[PDB]
Scaffold this motif. Structure first.
Motif, PDB file in Angstrom:
ATOM      1  N   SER B  83       5.610  16.074  16.778  1.00 23.36           N
ATOM      2  CA  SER B  83       5.344  15.242  15.717  1.00 23.36           C
ATOM      3  C   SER B  83       5.428  16.421  14.510  1.00 23.36           C
ATOM      4  O   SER B  83       5.913  15.852  13.473  1.00 23.36           O
ATOM      5  N   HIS B  84       4.488  17.186  14.735  1.00 25.95           N
ATOM      6  CA  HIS B  84       4.332  18.078  13.596  1.00 25.95           C
ATOM      7  C   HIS B  84       5.722  18.998  13.345  1.00 25.95           C
ATOM      8  O   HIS B  84       5.785  19.050  12.129  1.00 25.95           O
ATOM      9  N   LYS B  85       6.488  19.186  14.247  1.00 23.15           N
ATOM     10  CA  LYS B  85       7.615  19.919  13.789  1.00 23.15           C
ATOM     11  C   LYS B  85       8.621  18.899  13.195  1.00 23.15           C
ATOM     12  O   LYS B  85       9.461  19.335  12.213  1.00 23.15           O
ATOM     13  N   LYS B  86       8.446  17.698  13.661  1.00 22.10           N
ATOM     14  CA  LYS B  86       9.496  16.784  12.958  1.00 22.10           C
ATOM     15  C   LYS B  86       9.126  16.588  11.465  1.00 22.10           C
ATOM     16  O   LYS B  86       9.841  16.548  10.610  1.00 22.10           O
ATOM     17  N   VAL B  87       7.690  16.410  11.205  1.00 24.90           N
ATOM     18  CA  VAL B  87       7.347  16.239   9.867  1.00 24.90           C
ATOM     19  C   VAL B  87       7.481  17.366   9.110  1.00 24.90           C
ATOM     20  O   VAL B  87       7.951  17.160   7.878  1.00 24.90           O
ATOM     21  N   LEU B  88       7.450  18.789   9.535  1.00 24.02           N
ATOM     22  CA  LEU B  88       7.796  19.673   8.682  1.00 24.02           C
ATOM     23  C   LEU B  88       9.399  19.804   8.506  1.00 24.02           C
ATOM     24  O   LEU B  88       9.724  20.119   7.437  1.00 24.02           O
ATOM     25  N   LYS B  89      10.150  19.472   9.399  1.00 16.91           N
ATOM     26  CA  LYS B  89      11.391  19.482   9.235  1.00 16.91           C
ATOM     27  C   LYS B  89      11.797  18.482   8.263  1.00 16.91           C
ATOM     28  O   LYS B  89      12.735  18.568   7.280  1.00 16.91           O
ATOM     29  N   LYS B  90      11.376  17.073   8.273  1.00 17.96           N
ATOM     30  CA  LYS B  90      11.603  15.991   7.438  1.00 17.96           C
ATOM     31  C   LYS B  90      11.099  16.591   5.733  1.00 17.96           C
ATOM     32  O   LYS B  90      11.623  16.211   4.823  1.00 17.96           O
ATOM     33  N   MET B  91       9.987  17.048   5.785  1.00 17.93           N
ATOM     34  CA  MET B  91       9.590  17.625   4.305  1.00 17.93           C
ATOM     35  C   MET B  91      10.407  18.898   3.938  1.00 17.93           C
ATOM     36  O   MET B  91      10.499  18.775   2.668  1.00 17.93           O
ATOM     37  N   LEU B  92      10.994  19.468   4.805  1.00 16.15           N
ATOM     38  CA  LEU B  92      11.819  20.847   4.541  1.00 16.15           C
ATOM     39  C   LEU B  92      13.143  20.078   3.901  1.00 16.15           C
ATOM     40  O   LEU B  92      13.723  20.602   2.947  1.00 16.15           O
ATOM     41  N   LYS B  93      13.749  18.946   4.567  1.00 15.74           N
ATOM     42  CA  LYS B  93      14.854  18.301   3.964  1.00 15.74           C
ATOM     43  C   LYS B  93      14.692  17.630   2.589  1.00 15.74           C
ATOM     44  O   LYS B  93      15.196  17.494   1.778  1.00 15.74           O
ATOM     45  N   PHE B  94      12.969  17.125   2.512  1.00 22.23           N
ATOM     46  CA  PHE B  94      12.789  16.581   0.976  1.00 22.23           C
ATOM     47  C   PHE B  94      12.743  17.439   0.194  1.00 22.23           C
ATOM     48  O   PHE B  94      13.171  17.191  -1.149  1.00 22.23           O
TER      49      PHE B  94
END
Ligand SMILES: [Zn+2]
Ligand SMILES: [Zn+2]
Lengths: 348, 348
Positions: B83-94
């Motif tokens: 979940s943390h890695k997914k959040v980091l990847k999502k905010m990196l896309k943002f």
């Protein structure tokens, strides 16, 4: 600007007076000042409050064995006496070739200047305590020096109309050829300059540095008066007529003395016969002179309660203990109506 | 260094907690920290203490309706969850398809950086309190933002072996295009890194900064561990299993919890199937085990009384009534023998 946050302590216990030397001597109502503006501090000390660091106290003039009266002088109109002139001449001869710099150090540990001379100031304070007052060395540690001469709750605001140095708390250091010989604590305020404590090298006890420092501070206040019109006063701390060690402050004239009840300044010559008549006596030249700033609307008091700045009446509903209410009420009578609405009584 | 000075005040009445909404099950003890060093504050938080600004409080674990167990992370062997890695990847896309920076600032009004950013941080805190916690504007202000997030009782101790940024209270501000979108108040200590508080821009709640700020703090702690071998832990305040809002901190693994009756760190893997049956239990597998830092000799308690740093024995000899000595005994027991000898009880 930033509001004023203080905490009030009932302080219903007697304290040993340092002048009358009695166990049930100095009695005062205290408070713990977290952070107050210079204007609030000036208005408080206009009502008889005295600062001992972050802790402020108003002496109980009706119960203290040795009443303490705030005395101020006018540096612009001040005329030195024969003794003061002799002391100044002797100091000038000593300072001649056959050398001394006055330094203003703000009270802040983040200031490199304050930390550079902290050791010298502490050593000078230790020497003064062990020589003049003859206090035991174990009672003159670092904590005693810090909590009574380095804990300033005064915000160091520097308005453009004020002095270049700015308001707040400062130390006057007398560097003799790079060596500190005398340190005094001064509070710079828009209306006056307050004095709390002063110490010097006992080895130079023949120069009467306690008078030369006062003259230097008078000259500094007079120089500051050229910039600020409202800064034309200089407090002398406290005056006691039954203590010859501190009674020499009355020799500084022309001067004014603060009444214990009407909170007005009367000429020193008019009140000296009253002071010599009895230790405590209201001056009250007219029986119809009451305090203008006396608290009459306690609801205007601002209280930091429940993480909220609220009026006293508004927050009274949330508050439950009635006795604490009384502690607030007397507090108002000890701070005035103007200070009540500008200072936050933290209870969160 | 300067010894830490505290003033402990016992509380005989309960408070209202924001989790169980009960005003009779939130008893706690507290002390005003006039000035403390990091070396003592790290031991205090290891003993189960937290500060609401300049007021350090310890909950009564065995009596509070909502127990609050301190949780400690391990950045040395921290493996981020999916979940943390997914959040980091999502905010990196943002931040790439739709320039965040981290600024570390000390907590003191004398710092120009802190003073300059005091306005934007105040507005951000107001927005966070109004939108998230539903706090009305009357329950917030400059004093509220100052006495709860800007009051730092930690001395700026900066040993050469410590981090270049120094120890003490600090604020991590997440600047985004010159806008203050998130601020985290933390403490840098020789043993670990604390997390006093955290708030962020509600308009950016889509990014879920509540977990990202904790991840960034863990990364910062790991980076600090590279030079400081002693600094190998990171705290997340208190962890409440019952409250979901404080439960998200348990997603970080590996991590440990502090036993209230033993003050020893035990893995969360051995504690998760314990809180499902009760709220207060022994978090230690050895019944015949006690804390080695408990109160052993109360007479070695340092008291700053009558302008003198003295052991508790002579101070007790000077006093006569033993009823109020229980509060000092409770304070010594809570802080332990090691902290008692290095701390000054300001009760003069
Ligand atoms: Zn007295
Ligand atoms: Zn609760």
């Amino acid at each position: 600007g930033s509001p004023s946050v203080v905490d009030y302590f009932p302080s219903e216990d007697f304290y040993r007076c340092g002048y009358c030397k009695n166990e049930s001597g100095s009695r005062s109502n205290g408070m713990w000042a977290h952070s107050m503006t210079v204007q609030d501090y000036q208005d408080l000390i206009d009502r008889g409050w005295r600062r001992s660091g972050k802790y402020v106290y108003k002496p109980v003039m009706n119960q203290t064995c040795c009443p303490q009266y705030t005395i101020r002088c006018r540096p612009l109109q001040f005329q030195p006496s024969k003794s003061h002139k002799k002391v100044l001449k002797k100091m000038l001869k000593f300072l001649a070739k056959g050398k001394l710099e006055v330094r203003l150090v703000p009270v802040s540990f983040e200031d490199p200047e304050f930390k550079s001379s902290f050791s010298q100031s502490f050593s000078l304070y230790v020497k003064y305590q062990v020589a003049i007052h003859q206090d035991p060395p174990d009672e003159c540690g670092k904590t005693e020096f810090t909590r009574f001469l380095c804990s300033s709750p005064l915000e160091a605001e520097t308005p453009p109309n004020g002095p270049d140095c700015g308001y707040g708390s400062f130390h006057q250091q007398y560097w003799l050829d790079g060596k500190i010989i005398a340190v005094g604590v001064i509070d710079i305020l828009p209306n006056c300059v307050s004095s709390v404590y002063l110490y010097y090298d006992p080895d130079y006890s023949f120069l009467s540095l306690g008078v030369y420092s006062a003259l230097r501070e008078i000259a500094f206040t007079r120089q500051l008066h050229e910039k600020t019109s409202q800064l034309s006063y200089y407090y002398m701390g406290f005056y006691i007529h039954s203590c010859p060690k501190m009674k020499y402050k009355g020799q500084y004239r022309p001067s004014d003395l603060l009444c214990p009840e009407t909170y007005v300044w009367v000429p020193i010559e008019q009140c000296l016969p009253s002071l010599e008549n009895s230790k405590y006596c209201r001056f009250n030249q007219d029986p119809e002179a009451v305090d203008e700033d006396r608290s009459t609307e306690p609801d205007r008091l601002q209280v930091f309660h429940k993480r909220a700045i609220m009026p006293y009446g508004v927050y009274k509903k949330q508050q439950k203990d009635p006795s604490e209410e009384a502690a607030v009420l007397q507090y108002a009578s000890l701070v005035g109506q103007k200070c009540s609405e500008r200072m936050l009584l933290f209870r969160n």
